């Protein structure tokens, strides 16, 4: 996938500058519907232009539209982490899918 490679490359570029400057997102199981999960968890980051291309690139892999402000849960077992940690985690999962084919 060229699309997959482009996304990996964009994540590498943006996390090589602390990604979204003190914004926190909830973790998720990324092993199950990874792309939509990552978009769902990243769609509500509100003042970070560095993540916009990432958000658009992720939308290309999700087979439904991902809108901001939607209810998921109260995230009881989940945990707030930095966008950068989330994105670096996401990158690992994406590299494996690349490697798997």
């Amino acid at each position, epitope marked *: 996938s*060229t699309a997959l490679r482009e996304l990996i490359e964009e994540l590498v570029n943006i996390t090589q500058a602390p990604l979204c400057n003190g914004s926190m997102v909830w973790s998720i199981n990324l092993t199950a519907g990874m792309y939509c999960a990552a978009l769902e968890s990243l769609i509500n980051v509100s003042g970070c232009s560095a993540i916009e291309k990432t958000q658009r690139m992720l939308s290309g892999f999700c087979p439904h539209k991902v809108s901001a402000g939607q209810f998921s849960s109260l995230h009881v077992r989940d945990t707030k982490i930095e966008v950068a940690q989330f994105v670096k985690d996401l990158l690992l999962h994406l*590299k*494996k899918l*690349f490697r*798997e084919g």
Partner: antibody
Amino acid sequence: QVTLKESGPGILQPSQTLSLTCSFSGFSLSTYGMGVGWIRQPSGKGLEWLAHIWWDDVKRYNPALKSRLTISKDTSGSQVFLKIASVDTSDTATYYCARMGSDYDVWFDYWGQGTLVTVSA
Amino acid sequence: DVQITQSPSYLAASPGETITLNCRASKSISKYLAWYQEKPGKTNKLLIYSGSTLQSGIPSRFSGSGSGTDFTLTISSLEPEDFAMYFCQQHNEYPYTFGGGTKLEIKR
């Protein structure tokens, strides 16, 4: 520093199963980002990618040979193995193992010297 | 499945010359081409990857260029140790495929 070295049968009869070993120093296939592939060159012809394996056991195989190939590593991640089932004379080649220069992408930063395998009666 | 052509497959040049080698893919490979140097009794040496990225510890007189389907390796001011067989490999797409090489030999 990083070295790789192939070991093989030298010669085998057709319909046999070629077993190749790659031994290496200066890295382990239990470290993140590490992986090893097998590439071959029939004489006066070009290189042909066969298979590769990563530290987390993700494997890929050349679809033209997919069924005949099995790649593995040991639990100490210090050797890598290729099996080619049902060899014929088209499998006569020099066989190289090589380390991947990236944690996801497939180009090779270090190569072994190669070993000749002749498949003949 | 991408076929890689290196043409011409033979070149002669005198030291100090600047030369270019061609590598052509049968379909676009974005920028993902690697170049390797091959020498008798030596292990193959990676020079460039992703079209233009110089491997660590390789002299900067090696320069890779191109994108899509047409690629070049330029070696400027050839040193004696620079004469060798040079082959390319696309790493855009599985299965990975190699060009048939160009032998660069010294004119004397």
